[PDB]
Ligand binder design. Structure first.
Ligand SMILES: Nc1ncnc2c1ncn2[C@@H]1O[C@H](COP(=O)(O)OP(=O)(O)O)[C@@H](O)[C@H]1O
Ligand SMILES: CC(C)Oc1ccc2cccc(-n3cc(NC(N)=O)c(C(N)=O)n3)c2c1
Length: 263
């Protein structure tokens, strides 16, 4: 089962604060060390989430952070995840800026691409892929996390394309216009993630408001090439940012293309 009883969890240390609550390092009885995220009441549709648990627990891949289960005996509920020692990728890049070899940055993109190729085959859409949603583990492995979570977030300012906190910077035109999510909209987001990785954690379109990003993208403007990205890597980024979803590569194609470049 995916239900974890409160007696099977022990909170050891606070890791940090998230959008919807605290994150602790803890232990899960007879299992492993875990990261536990406490979810503020009202932040997510808990009943909708619990309905998909039996199906979603079957997803397992080396490049996806495992969500082991939920502790829901009383509010606030807890989500129990695999512990990722080095934390989020966006912070990891920013803190180690200037210490990365270009091969390591391409390797991080390849780990994410592998995890995303598994979700694409599984017909699971992430909806908010970004470096902030990737985590860094043992020996600097990158794993994707939080796929599908925006379908349960109750704050309309984040989930509505016309909302003030919407992640427009990682959104394809059909997502920011119509909320038309697909694995091809995740490919657009993946191109922005590659830009974040090769820029060592810079924020995309930092000099633009959300409406300015929409106008810029719609008139054909794209993110500039980071210094560390080769012209071949930047070409693949641009393929992710094609206006028509049908013209973007699938993750299965990107994985082969990026691997050929790396190997
Ligand atoms: N699985 C995990 N393992 C280790 N640290 C984690 C894990 N999930 C989240 N964290 C850490 O918890 C903090 C907040 O996490 P996150 O829940 O992603 O907040 P937010 O959703 O606002 O980004 C960050 O410092 C992040 O590195
Ligand atoms: C206990 C888990 C399996 O329950 C759910 C229920 C609904 C879900 C809906 C969307 C996505 C889910 N989801 C998210 C996951 N992992 C991370 N790191 O976010 C996993 C997994 N199997 O590792 N499943 C869900 C996971």
């Amino acid at each position: 089962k995916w239900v974890i009883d409160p007696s099977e969890l022990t909170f050891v240390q606070e890791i940090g604060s998230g959008q919807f609550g605290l994150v602790h390092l803890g232990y899960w009885l007879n299992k492993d060390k875990v990261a536990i995220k406490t979810i503020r009441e009202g932040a997510m549709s808990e009943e909708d989430f619990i309905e998909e648990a039996e199906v979603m627990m079957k997803l397992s891949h080396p490049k996806l952070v495992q969500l082991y289960g939920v502790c829901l005996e009383q509010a606030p509920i807890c989500l129990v995840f695999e512990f990722m020692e080095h934390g989020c990728l966006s912070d990891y890049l920013r803190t180690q800026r200037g210490l990365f070899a270009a091969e390591t940055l391409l390797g991080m993109c390849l780990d994410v691409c592998e995890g995303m190729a598994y979700l694409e085959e599984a017909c699971v859409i992430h909806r908010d892929l970004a470096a902030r949603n990737c985590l860094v583990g043992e020996n600097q492995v990158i794993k994707v996390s939080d796929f599908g979570m925006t379908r349960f977030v109750l704050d309309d300012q984040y989930t509505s394309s016309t909302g003030t906190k919407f992640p427009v910077k990682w959104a394809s035109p059909e997502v920011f216009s119509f909320s038309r999510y697909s694995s091809k909209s995740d490919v657009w987001s993946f191109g922005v993630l590659m830009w974040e990785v090769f820029s060592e954690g810079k924020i995309p379109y930092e000099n633009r408001s959300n409406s300015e990003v929409v106008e810029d993208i719609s008139t054909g403007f794209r993110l500039y090439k980071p210094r560390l990205a080769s012209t071949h890597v930047y070409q693949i980024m641009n393929h992710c940012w094609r206006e028509r979803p049908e013209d973007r590569p699938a993750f299965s194609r990107l994985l082969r293309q990026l691997a050929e470049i790396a190997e």
